[PDB]
Design a protein around this ligand. Structure first.
Ligand SMILES: [Mg+2]
Ligand SMILES: [Mg+2]
Ligand SMILES: [Mg+2]
Ligand SMILES: [Mg+2]
Ligand SMILES: [Mg+2]
Ligand SMILES: [Mg+2]
Ligand SMILES: [Mg+2]
Ligand SMILES: [Mg+2]
Ligand SMILES: [Mg+2]
Ligand SMILES: [Mg+2]
Ligand SMILES: [Mg+2]
Ligand SMILES: [Mg+2]
Ligand SMILES: [Mg+2]
Ligand SMILES: [Mg+2]
Ligand SMILES: [Mg+2]
Ligand SMILES: [Mg+2]
Ligand SMILES: [Mg+2]
Ligand SMILES: [Mg+2]
Ligand SMILES: [Mg+2]
Ligand SMILES: [Mg+2]
Ligand SMILES: [Mg+2]
Ligand SMILES: [Mg+2]
Ligand SMILES: [Mg+2]
Ligand SMILES: [Mg+2]
Ligand SMILES: [Mg+2]
Ligand SMILES: [Mg+2]
Ligand SMILES: [Mg+2]
Ligand SMILES: [Mg+2]
Lengths: 61, 129, 384
RNA sequence: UUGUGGCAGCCAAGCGUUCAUAGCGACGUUGCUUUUUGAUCCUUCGAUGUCGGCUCUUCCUAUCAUUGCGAAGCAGAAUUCACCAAGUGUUGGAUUGUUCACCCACCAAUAGGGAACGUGAGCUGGGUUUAGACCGUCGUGAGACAGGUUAGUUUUACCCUACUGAUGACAGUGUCGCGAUAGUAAUUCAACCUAGUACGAGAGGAACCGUUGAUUCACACAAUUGGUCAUCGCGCUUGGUUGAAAAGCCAGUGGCGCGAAGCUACCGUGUGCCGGAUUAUGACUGAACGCCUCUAAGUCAGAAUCCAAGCUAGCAUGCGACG
RNA sequence: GGUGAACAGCCUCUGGCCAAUGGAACAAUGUAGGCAAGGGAAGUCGGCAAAACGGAUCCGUAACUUCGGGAAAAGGAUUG
């Protein structure tokens, strides 16, 4: 099936779910759930929340 | 026709004017095709054609109601795909009663169900999404 | 002193009174009409409301924007173990209405149904149907049974079968005693209905016999109970302004000086919820029959070997091990409530009625919390 | 009571480019109604709480829209007059304390009406209608104003009934049913195709069927999104306090970020109904009246109508089968 | 005593109390207090009630003016 990839937790969205924000600079963020979206809007940096796939691959865990 | 999507812009709302006519700010006053109910404020969504005066803009546009079309709204809304899509700012564009874009171009993305519903805002848009 | 401004009435008067339903089981108040030419079949069934999930399907609908497009839809799961037919009733028409002509019961009757006849089973001697069971081990008893059947064949115009669910193959409920009802047979002549029943006593009828795919059914059951709940919630009347002495959430004028009485149509504060309701045209997408590859949630597009139960089980209900239906939309009652599936009464004819469903995906992520995987083994391979 | 207010007839001088009656209809005249006011002063002065708005319900037709029709100065589009029709609908706002009024916009439409000028132990107290105060005119003055202004308490239900819900006795007890009767709920529009067709010189310019959505309403549901936190769940953190780190605790929920579950939202979802009788009208056969005639006898087609079907209750101190 | 500009508030020690009838439950409606997506006065007679601002350091501070004020005007930035 066609999966998606959230752009704040880097985890895979399954069909029929997921919240796509369309930022004024025309680029598409596809959040996974409420928590990712609220951290994004609070301007948190994914690379420095410990639970994110981007943090984990950055530190090679 | 178009499906039903979350209604986000009541009257007295104030939206960006995302086109190159010079108006900086539309002001929603009423919505086409809406039939009311006691106390219920008329509401617009993406693709609904509204009436709007300009409160801050070019001097020669102000002080007169003009048909607008909403192209971006910040209230989420559920697609028929499942995804709850939305935008960053409320914004609409001037049109004429026959749906023509008064201006020439639209700055930024526009609602997909706005462009597909208005055949000219689709061409004046730069990036449909 | 007309009304300055109109607005449509709040609340429907076609659903009064609103008291507790006097029945936990959703009773059927009308069965599909008999058509003697169709072969004999049943017209209802009992299921249990497991929970809700969603699908994405490929719409086939020329003229719609959804044509050749995938749509995400909620669907409700009904865990639906086969009924056991343990009886037979005849109904004969009078100038008053219908009378029960007579009734016949099965020789063996399960432990769990015969609890339906006691308010205190355990202390009882369990003697229900004991001295009636003995009408089958003698020549005279068998004689009078066949006499009852010839009576029903020779007079009755409406034949029904008493069926009970096997409640115990749904360990999710903490309930041992059965639910029991009449399902009215349709089709054939009266002797064929009596033959169809008596042939099929004491044996199990699977929901595939009752329904088919893509068919619309109705679901009948008692709603959620919400308690003694006031007017703004129960009836929907708008709230009063903030600045009122003695409260906001009420109907201000409950009627004119005349009639010097309160009308039955004014909104008052009382019980909300736990009502009886029938809700028609709920479609069938998939019957899951336990023991065939239709039971797992692997479509022809997805193939992740998962069963219908979402991760961590259905909240408040458990894990679906039995048969099940998967119907478009919602279902009355909370989780673990019994729901009567009933064949429709119209002649389904629309493009929606004829529309054929083929899924592509069934959400299985734990409905308890923001689920994010499909399967336990995939959560395990993702962590390590 | 009905002059005054509103509403409808009869006559037909004329308007309606020729043509009284398509649509009017002066001069007269016959009424109807009781939301105004006038008139009276019959009940009420050991008190019936007095304008308006908000809320909610019901009812009326003297019909604005919507379903079916008839007529035209009906070519098509629009529009005007009337018919059975009261089932459904009748809005958001600026200004005013206003009912009234007037504008802007949407709309299929923004018709009119009652219920003690519905509705104050339902609110509000803007107006009015006390005591403070000010101006303008009058008064010599104490003061007056059906002149404008500003501040000015809104008490009680626990009684009976009504109503909305909750138990419940009356052939032992328990399942499964019947169904008298009462309620009843569905409403409207748009887009594509029909079609730039029919009609029309041109300008303009339809509709049925079909297909797709939508509005208003109703009833449910919580997978998805959103809302909610005292899970005091996890984390962060201020001030203090336990010799200190660790673990906490105190600040009535210390504060913030997130926050499952439960409830919940046209802010999310799903669904919303099948026969016959018939009105208005158009008709069939056929008289009276050799002909004609929808009517006299007898029939037909016929609607947002009606009654059922369906949906809700079914202590109707009703009933059936059975254990 | 601590924080703080402080006899503000918030916590503590000496000293004094737990005196305000108790038990069970989490229904409407209340009273006191919170929070809310999109919009921000469209509600309403009237922005009534509530929200937003708020300390301090640095900069900047208009019309008008009795030249004393306006003035903490406005608009900005920093804070562990
Ligand atoms: Mg959430
Ligand atoms: Mg209003
Ligand atoms: Mg009124
Ligand atoms: Mg009215
Ligand atoms: Mg509801
Ligand atoms: Mg008050
Ligand atoms: Mg959940
Ligand atoms: Mg009169
Ligand atoms: Mg008069
Ligand atoms: Mg008098
Ligand atoms: Mg008096
Ligand atoms: Mg009184
Ligand atoms: Mg009439
Ligand atoms: Mg009263
Ligand atoms: Mg006053
Ligand atoms: Mg005074
Ligand atoms: Mg005065
Ligand atoms: Mg009835
Ligand atoms: Mg939640
Ligand atoms: Mg100090
Ligand atoms: Mg101090
Ligand atoms: Mg809010
Ligand atoms: Mg205001
Ligand atoms: Mg208003
Ligand atoms: Mg206003
Ligand atoms: Mg005003
Ligand atoms: Mg204030
Ligand atoms: Mg100043």
């Amino acid at each position: 099936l066609k999966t998606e990839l959230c752009r704040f937790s880097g985890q895979k969205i399954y069909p029929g779910k997921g919240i796509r924000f369309i930022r004024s600079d025309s680029q598409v963020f596809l959040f996974a759930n409420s928590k990712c979206k609220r951290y994004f809007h609070n301007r948190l940096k994914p690379a420095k929340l410990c639970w994110t796939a981007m943090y984990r691959k950055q530190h090679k865990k | 026709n178009k499906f039903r999507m979350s209604l986000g812009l009541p009257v007295a709302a104030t939206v960006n004017c995302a086109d190159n006519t010079g108006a900086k700010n539309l002001y929603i006053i009423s919505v086409k095709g809406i039939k009311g109910r006691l106390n219920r404020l008329p509401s617009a969504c993406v693709g609904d054609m509204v009436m709007a005066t300009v409160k801050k803009g070019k001097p020669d546009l102000r002080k007169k109601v003009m048909p607008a079309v909403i192209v971006r709204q910040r209230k989420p809304w559920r697609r028929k795909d499942g995804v709850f899509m939305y935008f960053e700012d409320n914004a609409g564009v001037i049109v004429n009663p026959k749906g023509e874009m008064k201006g020439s171009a639209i700055t930024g993305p526009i609602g997909k169900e706005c462009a597909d519903l208005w055949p000219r805002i689709a061409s004046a848009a730069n990036a449909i999404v | 002193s007309h009304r300055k401004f109109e607005h449509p009435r709040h609340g429907s008067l076609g659903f009064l009174p609103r008291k507790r339903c006097s029945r936990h089981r959703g009773k059927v108040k009308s069965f599909p009409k008999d058509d003697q030419q169709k072969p004999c079949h049943l017209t209802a069934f009992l299921g249990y409301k497991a929970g809700m999930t969603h699908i994405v399907r490929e719409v086939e609908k020329p003229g719609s924007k959804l044509h050749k497009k995938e749509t995400c839809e909620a669907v409700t799961i009904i865990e639906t173990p086969p009924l056991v037919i343990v009886g037979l009733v005849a109904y004969v028409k009078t100038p008053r209405g219908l009378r029960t002509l007579n009734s016949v019961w099965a020789q063996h009757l399960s432990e769990d149904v015969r609890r339906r006849f006691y308010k205190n089973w355990c202390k009882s001697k369990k003697k229900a149907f004991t001295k009636y069971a003995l009408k089958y081990d003698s020549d005279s008893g068998k004689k009078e049974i066949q006499l009852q059947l010839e009576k029903m064949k020779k007079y009755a115009t409406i034949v029904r079968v008493i069926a009970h669910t096997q409640i115990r193959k749904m360990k999710g409920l903490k309930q041992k005693k059965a639910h029991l009802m009449e399902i009215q047979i349709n089709g054939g002549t009266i002797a064929d209905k009596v033959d169809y029943g008596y042939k099929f006593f004491e044996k199990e009828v699977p929901v595939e016999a009752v329904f088919q795919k893509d068919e619309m059914v109705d679901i009948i059951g008692v709603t959620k109970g919400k308690g003694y709940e006031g007017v703004v919630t129960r009836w929907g009347v708008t709230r009063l302004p903030r600045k009122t002495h003695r409260g906001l959430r009420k109907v201000a004028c409950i009627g004119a000086w005349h009639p010097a009485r309160v009308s039955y149509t004014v909104a008052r504060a009382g019980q909300n919820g736990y009502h009886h309701r029938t809700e028609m045209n709920k479609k069938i997408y998939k019957m899951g029959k336990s023991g065939q590859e239709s039971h797992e949630a692997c479509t022809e597009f997805d193939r992740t070997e998962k069963d219908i139960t979402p991760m961590g089980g259905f909240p408040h209900y458990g894990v679906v091990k039995g048969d099940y239906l998967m119907i478009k939309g919602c279902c009355v009652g909370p989780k673990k409530r019994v729901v009567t599936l009933r064949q429709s009464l119209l002649k389904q004819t629309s493009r929606l009625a004829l529309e054929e469903i083929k899924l592509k995906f069934i959400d299985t992520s734990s409905k308890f919390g923001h689920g994010r995987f499909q399967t336990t083994d995939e959560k395990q391979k993702f962590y390590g």
